[PDB]
Design an enzyme around this catalytic site. Structure first.
Site, PDB file in Angstrom:
ATOM      1  N   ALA A 169     -12.850  39.715  13.458  1.00 51.32           N
ATOM      2  CA  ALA A 169     -12.864  40.658  12.573  1.00 51.32           C
ATOM      3  C   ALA A 169     -12.594  40.479  10.966  1.00 51.32           C
ATOM      4  O   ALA A 169     -13.225  40.638   9.901  1.00 51.32           O
ATOM      5  CB  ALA A 169     -12.048  41.961  12.870  1.00 51.32           C
TER       6      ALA A 169
ATOM      7  N   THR B 229     -17.663  43.628  20.156  1.00 52.65           N
ATOM      8  CA  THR B 229     -19.085  44.057  19.453  1.00 52.65           C
ATOM      9  C   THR B 229     -20.236  44.192  20.264  1.00 52.65           C
ATOM     10  O   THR B 229     -20.319  43.431  21.112  1.00 52.65           O
ATOM     11  CB  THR B 229     -19.204  43.146  18.106  1.00 52.65           C
ATOM     12  OG1 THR B 229     -17.986  43.334  17.195  1.00 52.65           O
ATOM     13  CG2 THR B 229     -20.329  43.951  17.340  1.00 52.65           C
TER      14      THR B 229
END
Ligand SMILES: *[C@@](C)(CO)[C@](*)(O)[C@H](Cc1ccccc1)NC(=O)[C@H](Cc1ccc(OC)cc1)NC(=O)[C@H](C)NC(=O)CN1CCOCC1
Lengths: 239, 196, 231, 233, 213, 238, 204, 248, 201
Positions: free
Chosen positions: I49, I1
């Site tokens: 996630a 990310t």
């Protein structure tokens, strides 16, 4: 382990154990509180303190958090438990949510606790009514009450205890914007309401004020006696 | 890496801590406060593990506040430090041990100024001066050098300033600002934040 | 399939009395007479052991039981109830010894035993013990005599009698007992206090007696009881 | 004297039947199911002019699409309402969809006979809930009204009234209600019946009104929009 | 030490059209360097609107499909409804996460129809992370199927192509082509390809042979 | 009079009043008719309106694909037992991948319902059930009571004025096994019809039908789905 | 070593009708000194003391948990505790944590009530009693302390001679240990008085 | 099972706890026990009920219990129930010292035990503790203090109070003689002998019939001292001269 | 990310990418890393996630219950504390999530950073993820409290772009949110490839 149903329904649909607990608050000391527009003040009568008793230890007005305080009527031993449970909850709300407790929330907790004691095995209802007072981080003053059943409502002014009916109807007449103009006059309304039941107070009146600026201020028998004289020349102003 | 320091005089306790909150190589915060208000006259300076610091110091904080509400009066600095130590000592051999190195400062009604040092193992000790963090290794000798029990508060700040300037010269970690507070009979006082 | 009642069976009457305890006191009052005397040199505990049928084996079951090397017991009231307290007192005595490596003081044991007796007047679904205890012991170079009754209250005596004719027993005691009587003389007056309420003529298999001094607590052998019966 | 789970010779449970009698003491509440939506009405029954009328909440929202109106012992419903609110959020968390009006009514109804003495948990109920409920909302089947009582029985109603004067109100609803009436007709009809049975004169602050409709979410009426239909007597 | 897991191969693929949803997988079940069975289709039907595909550790795959079956009947009784494609996907997320600290070694792809009647594909990681997409591959050969789908279905990296909507014929052709190509390189993929097609009429099954080496 | 408070108290006559009172709750609710043929099992249930401004009570509930029930008595006890029945069926399909035999499910109900009738402070289940199921042994009709006693019956009806249905079912009993599905339901409705006052009979509002068999899984018919069954009606010859 | 983390040394010595108990004053974490005035010897009943050496937490946790039990004892019993009784209490306390003990080896020094008889003992971290008539030691410089006591201690010593022996035994032992020192406090316990002295020592 | 339950923790039709009020009647049968707060200290005076010639006298007291370094209590009611509470009081006092490392404040010890007594009145189904306690002590917050405790779990601070036999007659006698802020330990002791003389139905009052304990602040530490027979006899003879002073 | 958030004169900007990786393999480039808790409350996600998606969804459940129970919206400080407490129970278990919680309070624009390690700090600007060290670079060089609404958009949009250029585990599209007094709005969702062409002018 002791699972016996204490509170049950009656043939006519009543909960006697709850109603009996509501009789216990009726026998308790008269507690009244009024909501102004800058300060909220509550006070307790029907004292009859033996003089030989330490008056500091028998206070019926208790602080719960930095912004919340309460008074009660009925079984003094029962209240001490509730107060301690309410105080723990005030700090537990700060450990989970960080934000301080609101006046409505803490009332909702006390009410739910008292309600849980009318619908549980082996437990008996609390024999107290509480008058919860505080200020929201909003500016608006608040005044709530609870009872043994677990029902709670907001009040502009309310009285519970011995001769609650008498003070309730005195407040209904005397509660106007003129009576709650400044700080002194809102305090006068409480004391004038207490003189309806108590045999000339000053020594027999315990009362405390709360502002949105400072914490709780319990007034001493010197500051209370000042209001005895200030209203006396109002009463003796008929000529 | 975090830093704590405490200097006790005849009638005050001077405490300071860095305002840096770091993650691996980055400074995520510039104005971090490592000081926790327990009472009107007690501060708890907590340093150590990422999660344990906030969780532990805050738990003690609300308990002291609960004591304030429960009894009408506040805990003494001595009683506060022992309460913190008990909760830390008990958890030491449990499933959730708190890795926090803390420093408690307070002023008592009858006993006066008090400063307590505490290990993450929960070893409590009273000291005239104490420091935590890697920065302690560079500063403690300066405290040993220029300290008398009769040190005035204005010269205690100078002594503190001597310590913080050493952290700019020798200490490899960037620590620009420090929170400075004094505790005496009047309570907790905010001071000018020492910046570089 | 079982659980247990959680409510008390001992409650306060409108007059303010714990009725079950006073009725348990009736049980001890109807029990066989037992006497205890502190000699300031030792302690003597004597009880009536009327066997009623001769078919009964006397030596099989004892009324005077030892808790440990230096503490002894008697009762008035219900045999079965007494036996439970005996096991509990012995176990309590061992708890103390395991911690302190020191023989439990009589006073401490009595306090611990009385606590158990207190529990059975308040705990869920139980009745109080129908037993009063006579606990004797030697520790700290000093003799001790205690009484523990159904309520859970304890008393320290110089001399007392319980069971049938406890009134006649005590009035005989304060009239005959003096705080100077040596253990040998204490045994005599212990037997005499039982003789005041015996009705049946005594034999060495008819009464049980135990002594307690610096040498420890022991039950007197039938031969010793026979020789003392030569009054 | 008996236990809480005792059957009467007729076949019903004593404590449950006595709980129905507790509803007869509570304030009257009306609900009407309509093509255009569902309206919920209740009288507050304020005993003192010093009491803040807005703090008496007898109609609360469970989700955006579901509202609920209670009668009897208000304090008992608070746990039932919270359990309902938790169930709708638990359903959303697991299934990424809103829960149906019938399902929420059914979930609460499961808690109804969860009382007893022996063989009970450390935190178990001792008596039935002294509260009747009117669930009103919109799902796939459209606007729906559901009624619940202490016995645990839940049923869909076209229009229902529960409380002290529930007998007279229900017959008034049978006289007025039909399938094609609008929501504006439904609110108007519910208030007229409410003012008839009330001891006090029907006022803006005296009552509570809420509607759930296919158009938009649960909406509780304010003083102004209450007065909008109070002026239609 | 005992290991509770085993890699059993299998690759699952799903493509969402406008009126259809295709879920396809090879039929090979393997362990180590050996083959367990040549007939083991990974695509399993749940409702009239939804089909699921499971790959990875077969033990977990069998248990999870049995858990879903149970939970699907539980929803039916409680709600009087058939559980929708999106609601199953949201549920499967919670079921996989409930075993967070002892994961199901499983790669799920849900393919079916939504409430509007349009095609839907949901991709899953072992521990519950999921999203909706137009096309997804999961399994041993997922890194082989995906790039071609990105290029042909998504038109990615291409300069001047029209963007013609997905037809059933082209999508079916695309499933067969990628699986034949994956069977050439991945040792776990082969034997036979089974395709499940979800439309308004229901679920159809089609089988085409693959390499068996 | 003093023996009618607890299930643990035996009457001097050798009866348990608390179990007998719970059985009365079954006779309180409206009648339901269960009957089977050779391939199909049918449940026909009459519904009660608390006030015909409200809907008629739900009387038929699903258990599994091959098993369904019609309840008579307390609704909350009915749903509690229903959830137990569902669970046992779900466990069977989870473990063995095959449907739970009807007789075995009923035997489990007998176990669960017996427990409270012998424990102090507990009460019997205030609901009787008619269970329709199909397995390897064909269609089934089972009757349960508040007492953990159960019956494997050819046909059965329980509820308010269900006495009239019992008479009808007994006379047309020999016709049942050789009967087809279409008429097997008709026989059910004509039994449920007898349990009504002579003013009005079966309509689309008050009739619920549950059918299971070799052909189809358990399906509930209620309103528009129930109207084909009512067509071909024969008026009351009282 | 877990015992070498905080360092420290506690010593007890038997005299004529008296007992002495000494300890170093350093509180340090490994190499770093933190406090120069740390308390390791604790009063248990006027004429009876306990010195705890080991991990600084456990020194403090045991001292406080022992006083908890001792106060309850002295209230339950009508008497003050006896030296042998305390020793068995400490042994009991330490053995309760058999499979996860407090890292402290205590030393008890005091005079028996009424009999005024001297008493010294040392214990394990799991509470094994060891009574002697000469000396008991505990700490990081166990070996250093033993060498001093064996060569210095004499049978009957008057309070002054006893003080000189324990002081010299502590000082010279501590000076060969890196994690011990920074001052030595000594308690001389007599029937009529208690003499408490801090010695002139090295601070390196 | 529910037939044998006497419902100990239940409200009465009038809204009061029967088992608590019935327990309070038990206190009125027990020995007279009073407490008086002074400026230089605080004392307890109790009627001895164990007054037999054949009793041994082994303990320092019959009714007075030492709880803390700074605190003590006296008992009226069922003596066994008192042994439970006094033992628990000592534990609470030690718990506080273990955690905070300072003596428990007087009010905090009283409330802690009262929380327990209250509990037995609201849940559990057990009978309440038939004991009323009087507490004396000193802390760094309020100084010398005197507290009273009920079987209900209700507590109160008093300057002068009495509980047990002739409780009402004794409290009105204290209501007469007591001077607020003017009472010294000598004057409070003289008051204690006077009140007990009138409430004692055997009005000769020997030292073996009474029991007096004093709590004084002495050079930084608290001193709890039970007066022995020669001290008590001397106090009674002082009072006995006041009966001879009426001859004027 | 890469995720970032900062507060300026006109509100609070929230930016994220859309790449999801499974080791060195790119699993997705279309994930919505900003979670819409309330019409005014948002939550970013970086790390595991599944862990991120679950707990923030659990928080969104938690906040709605708070809204129903108290008749008021939850504060940013309160919302952040709840997540911090929930995740702290699981410290050491191996959960991985670095999140920013941000909305508008009675106190005004709030921004908090929450760790799976147990961190909770209020700040005026944050960057979380594997490419956080790159986003911080340009976000700090082009930051001022006096930035215009469109200028603030460009700062955040470019800050994610620069992070995708250096970090292997960041890419996809740059998603933008603007938290204002009334609530938040979806600003833009531009592909990194499309932005690459525009930033070359
Ligand atoms: C950037 C892209 C990479 O670090 C982000 O952190 C991104 C955040 C995100 C949030 C929601 C949806 C998609 C993306 N994180 C990931 O893409 C993440 C990387 C990661 C893997 C493992 C970690 O330790 C627990 C921490 C971070 N990728 C995943 O989570 C992938 C989809 N899932 C797996 O790796 C499978 N399981 C195996 C069992 O253990 C948990 C992960």
């Amino acid at each position: 382990s002791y699972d016996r149903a204490i509170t049950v329904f009656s043939p006519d649909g009543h909960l006697f154990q709850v109603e009996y607990a509501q009789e216990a608050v009726k026998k308790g000391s008269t507690a009244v509180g009024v909501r102004g527009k800058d300060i909220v003040v509550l006070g307790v009568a029907k004292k009859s303190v033996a003089k030989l008793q330490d008056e500091r230890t028998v206070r019926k007005i208790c602080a719960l958090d930095d912004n919340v305080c309460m008074a009660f009527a009925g079984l003094t031993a029962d209240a001490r438990i509730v107060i301690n449970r309410a105080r723990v909850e005030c700090q537990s709300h700060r450990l989970t949510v960080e934000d301080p407790v609101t006046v409505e929330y803490i009332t909702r907790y006390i009410a739910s606790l008292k309600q849980r004691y009318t619908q549980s095995n082996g437990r008996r209802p609390f024999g107290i009514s509480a008058l919860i007072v505080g200020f929201d981080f909003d500016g608006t003053p608040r005044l709530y009450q609870t009872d043994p059943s677990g029902t709670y409502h907001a009040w502009k002014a309310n009285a519970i205890g011995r001769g609650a009916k008498s003070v309730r109807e005195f407040l209904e007449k005397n509660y106007t914007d003129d009576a709650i103009e400044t700080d002194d006059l809102t305090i006068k309304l409480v004391i004038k309401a207490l003189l309806e039941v108590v045999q000339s107070g000053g020594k027999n009146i315990e009362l405390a004020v709360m502002r949105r600026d400072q914490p709780l201020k319990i007034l001493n028998p010197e500051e209370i006696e000042k209001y005895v004289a200030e209203i006396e020349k109002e009463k003796e102003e008929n000529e | 890496m975090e830093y704590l320091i405490g200097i006790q005089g005849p009638d005050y306790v001077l405490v300071a801590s860095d305002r840096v909150a770091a993650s691996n190589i980055v400074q995520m915060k510039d104005d971090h406060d490592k000081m926790f208000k327990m009472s009107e006259k007690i501060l708890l300076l907590c340093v150590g593990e990422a999660g344990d610091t906030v969780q532990f110091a805050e738990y003690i904080q609300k308990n002291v506040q609960l004591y304030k509400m429960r009894n009408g009066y506040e805990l003494s600095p001595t009683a506060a430090a022992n309460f913190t130590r008990r909760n830390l000592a008990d958890c030491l051999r449990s499933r959730t041990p708190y890795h926090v190195n803390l420093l408690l400062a307070g002023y008592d009604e009858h006993e006066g100024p008090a400063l307590y040092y505490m290990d993450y193992l929960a070893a409590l000790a009273k000291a005239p001066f104490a420091a935590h963090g890697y920065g302690a290794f560079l500063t403690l000798s300066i405290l040993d050098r220029y300290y008398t029990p009769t040190i005035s508060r204005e010269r205690a700040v100078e002594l503190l300033r001597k310590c913080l300037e050493e952290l700019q010269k020798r200490f490899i970690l960037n620590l620009p600002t420090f929170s400075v507070r004094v505790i005496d009979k009047d309570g907790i006082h905010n001071l000018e934040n020492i910046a570089f | 399939a079982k659980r247990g009642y959680s409510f008390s069976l001992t409650t306060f009457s409108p007059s303010g009395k714990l009725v079950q305890i006073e009725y348990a006191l009736a049980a001890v009052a109807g029990g066989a007479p037992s006497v205890g005397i502190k000699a300031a040199n030792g302690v003597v505990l004597a009880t009536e052991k009327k066997q009623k049928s001769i078919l009964y084996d006397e030596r099989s079951v004892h009324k005077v039981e030892p808790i440990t090397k230096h503490i002894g017991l008697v009762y008035s009231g219900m045999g079965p109830d007494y036996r439970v307290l005996v096991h509990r007192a012995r176990k309590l005595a061992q708890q103390y010894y395991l911690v302190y490596q020191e023989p439990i003081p009589t006073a401490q044991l009595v306090q611990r035993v009385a606590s158990v007796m207190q529990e059975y007047t308040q705990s869920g679904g139980v009745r109080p013990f129908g037993v009063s205890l006579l606990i004797c012991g030697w520790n700290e170079g000093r003799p001790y005599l205690f009484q523990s009754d159904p309520s859970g209250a304890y008393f320290a005596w110089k001399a007392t009698a319980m069971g049938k004719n406890y009134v006649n027993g005590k009035t005989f005691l304060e009239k005959r007992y003096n705080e100077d009587l040596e253990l040998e003389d204490a045994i005599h007056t212990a037997i005499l206090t039982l003789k005041e309420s015996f009705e049946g003529q005594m034999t060495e298999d008819n009464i049980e007696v135990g002594i307690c001094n610096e040498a420890g607590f022991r039950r007197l052998t039938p031969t010793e009881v026979r020789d003392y019966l030569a009054a | 004297d008996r236990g809480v789970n005792t059957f009467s010779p007729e076949g019903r449970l004593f404590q449950v039947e006595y709980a129905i009698e507790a509803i007869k003491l509570g304030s009257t509440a009306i609900g009407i199911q309509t093509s255009e939506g569902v309206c919920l009405a209740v009288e507050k029954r304020i005993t003192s002019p010093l009491m803040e009328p807005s703090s008496i909440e007898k109609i609360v929202e469970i989700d955006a699409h579901i509202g609920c109106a209670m009668s009897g012992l208000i304090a008992d419903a608070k746990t039932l309402i919270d359990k309902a609110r938790v169930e709708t959020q638990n359903h959303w968390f697991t299934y990424n969809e809103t829960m149906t009006v019938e399902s929420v009514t059914q979930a609460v109804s499961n808690l109804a006979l969860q009382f007893g003495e022996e063989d009970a948990d450390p935190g178990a109920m001792s008596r039935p809930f002294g509260v009747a409920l009117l669930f009103g909302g919109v799902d796939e089947k459209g606007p729906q009204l559901f009624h619940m009582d202490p016995s645990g029985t839940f049923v869909q109603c076209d229009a229902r009234a529960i409380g002290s004067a529930s007998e007279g109100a229900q017959s008034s609803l049978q006289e007025v209600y039909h399938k094609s009436m609008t929501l504006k007709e439904a609110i108007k009809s519910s208030l007229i019946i409410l003012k008839q049975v009330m001891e006090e004169k029907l006022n803006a602050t005296n009552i509570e009104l809420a509607t759930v409709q296919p158009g938009q979410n649960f909406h509780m009426f304010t003083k102004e929009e209450l007065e909008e239909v109070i002026k239609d007597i | 030490r005992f290991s509770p897991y085993a890699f059993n191969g299998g690759t699952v693929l799903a493509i969402a059209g406008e009126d259809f949803s295709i879920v396809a997988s090879d039929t090979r079940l393997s362990e180590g360097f050996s083959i367990h069975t040549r007939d083991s289709p990974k695509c399993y039907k749940l409702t009239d609107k939804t089909v699921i595909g499971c790959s990875g550790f077969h033990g977990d795959c069998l248990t999870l499909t049995k858990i879903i079956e149970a939970r699907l009947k539980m929803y039916k009784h409680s709600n009087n409804k058939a559980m929708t494609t999106g609601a199953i996907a949201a549920m499967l997320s919670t079921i996989l996460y409930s075993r967070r600290f002892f994961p199901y070694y499983v790669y799920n792809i849900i393919g079916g129809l939504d409430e509007e009647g349009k095609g839907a594909v949901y991709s899953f990681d072992p521990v519950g992370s999921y999203q909706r997409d137009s096309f997804k591959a999961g399994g041993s050969a997922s890194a082989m199927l995906q790039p071609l789908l990105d290029n042909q279905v998504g038109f990615k990296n291409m300069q001047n192509v029209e963007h013609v909507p997905l037809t059933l014929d082209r999508a079916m052709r695309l499933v067969k082509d990628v699986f034949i190509s994956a069977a050439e390189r991945d040792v776990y993929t082969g034997d036979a390809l089974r395709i499940c097609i979800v439309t308004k009429e229901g679920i159809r099954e089609e089988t085409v042979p693959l390499r068996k080496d | 009079n003093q023996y009618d408070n607890d299930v643990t108290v035996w009457s001097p006559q050798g009866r348990i009043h608390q179990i007998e009172y719970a059985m009365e709750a079954v006779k309180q609710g409206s009648a339901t008719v269960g009957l089977k043929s050779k391939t199909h099992a049918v449940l026909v249930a009459l519904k009660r309106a608390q006030s015909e401004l409200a809907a008629h009570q739900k009387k038929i509930l699903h258990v599994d694909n091959h098993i369904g029930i019609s309840i008579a008595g307390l609704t909350a006890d009915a749903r509690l037992l229903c959830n137990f029945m569902r669970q046992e069926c779900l466990d069977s399909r989870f473990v063995f991948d095959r449907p739970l035999p009807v007789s075995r499910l009923v035997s489990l109900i007998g176990s669960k319902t017996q427990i409270p009738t012998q424990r102090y402070g507990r009460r019997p289940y205030g609901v009787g059930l008619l269970i329709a199921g199909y397995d390897d042994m064909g269609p089934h009709i089972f009757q349960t009571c508040p007492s953990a006693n159960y019956f494997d019956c050819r046909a059965m009806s329980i509820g308010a004025r269900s006495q009239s249905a019992r008479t009808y079912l007994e006379r047309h009993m020999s016709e049942f096994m050789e009967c087809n599905l279409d008429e097997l339901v008709k026989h059910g409705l004509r039994a449920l019809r007898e349990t009504l006052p002579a003013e009005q009979d079966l309509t689309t509002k008050n009739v619920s039908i549950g059918i299971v068999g070799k052909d189809l899984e358990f399906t509930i018919y209620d309103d528009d789905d129930v109207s084909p069954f009512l067509d071909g009606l024969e008026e009351r010859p009282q | 070593s877990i015992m070498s983390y905080n360092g420290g040394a506690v010593m007890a010595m038997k005299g004529k009708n008296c007992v002495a108990i000494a300890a170093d004053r350093r509180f340090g974490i490994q190499a770093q000194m933190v406090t120069t005035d740390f308390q390791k010897i604790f009063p248990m009943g006027d004429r009876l003391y306990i010195g705890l050496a080991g991990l600084a937490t456990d020194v403090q946790t045991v001292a406080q948990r022992l006083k908890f039990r001792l106060n309850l004892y002295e209230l339950k019993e009508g008497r003050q505790i006896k030296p042998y009784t305390l020793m068995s209490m400490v042994a009991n306390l330490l053995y309760e944590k058999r499979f996860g003990p407090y890292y402290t080896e205590p030393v008890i020094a005091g005079l028996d009530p009424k009999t005024f008889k001297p008493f010294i003992c040392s214990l394990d971290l799991i509470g094994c009693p060891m009574v002697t008539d000469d000396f008991v030691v505990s700490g990081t410089c166990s070996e250093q302390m033993y060498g001093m006591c064996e060569s210095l201690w004499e049978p009957n010593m008057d309070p002054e001679h006893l003080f000189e022996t324990i002081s010299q035994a502590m000082l010279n032992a501590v000076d060969r240990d890196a994690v011990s020192g920074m001052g030595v406090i000594v308690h001389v316990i007599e029937k009529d008085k208690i003499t408490t002295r801090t010695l002139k020592a090295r601070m390196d | 099972s529910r037939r044998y339950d006497s419902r100990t923790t239940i409200f009465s039709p009038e809204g009061r706890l029967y088992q608590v009020e019935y327990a309070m009647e038990a206190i009125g049968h027990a020995g007279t026990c009073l407490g008086i707060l002074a400026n230089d200290g605080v004392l307890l005076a109790a009627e001895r009920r164990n007054i037999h010639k054949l009793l041994d006298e082994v303990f320092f007291s019959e009714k007075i219990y030492k709880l803390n370094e700074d605190m003590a209590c006296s008992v009226a009611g069922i003596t066994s129930d008192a042994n439970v509470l006094t033992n628990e009081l000592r534990l609470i006092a030690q718990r506080y010292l273990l955690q905070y490392q300072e003596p428990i404040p007087c009010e905090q010890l009283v409330t802690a035990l009262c929380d327990i007594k209250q509990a037995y009145t609201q849940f559990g189904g057990k009978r309440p503790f038939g004991v009323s306690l009087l507490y004396i002590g000193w802390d760094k917050h309020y100084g010398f203090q005197l507290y009273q405790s009920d079987p209900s779990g209700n507590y109160g601070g008093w300057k002068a109070t009495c509980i047990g036999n002739n409780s009402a007659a004794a409290v009105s006698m204290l209501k007469q003689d007591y001077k607020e802020g003017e009472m010294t330990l000598k004057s409070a002791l003289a008051l204690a002998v006077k009140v007990l003389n009138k409430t004692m139905d055997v009005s000769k009052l020997s030292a073996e019939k009474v029991e007096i304990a004093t709590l004084t602040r002495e050079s930084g530490k608290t001193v709890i001292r039970v007066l022995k027979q020669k001290e008590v006899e001397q106090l009674i003879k002082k009072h006995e001269e006041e009966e001879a002073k009426a001859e004027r | 990310t890469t995720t970032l958030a900062f507060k300026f004169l006109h509100g609070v900007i929230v930016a994220a990418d859309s790449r999801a990786t499974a080791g060195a393999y790119i699993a997705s480039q279309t994930v919505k890393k900003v979670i819409e808790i309330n019409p005014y409350l948002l939550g970013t996600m970086a790390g595991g996630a599944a862990d991120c998606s679950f707990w923030e969804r659990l928080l969104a459940r938690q906040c709605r219950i708070y809204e129903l129970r108290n008749k008021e919206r939850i504060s940013v400080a309160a919302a952040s504390k709840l997540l911090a407490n929930m995740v702290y129970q699981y410290k050491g278990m191996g959960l991985s999530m670095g999140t920013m919680i941000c909305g508008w309070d009675k106190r005004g624009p709030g921004l908090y950073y929450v760790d799976s390690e147990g961190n909770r700090i209020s700040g005026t600007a944050f960057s979380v993820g594997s490419g956080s060290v790159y986003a911080y670079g340009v976000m700090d060089r082009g930051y001022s409290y006096d930035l215009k609404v469109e200028e603030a958009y460009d700062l955040a949009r470019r800050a994610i772009y620069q992070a995708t250029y250096r970090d292997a585990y960041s890419g996809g599209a740059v998603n933008l949110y603007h938290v204002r007094e009334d609530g938040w709005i979806r600003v833009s969702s531009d592909n990194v490839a499309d932005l690459h062409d525009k930033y070359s002018s």
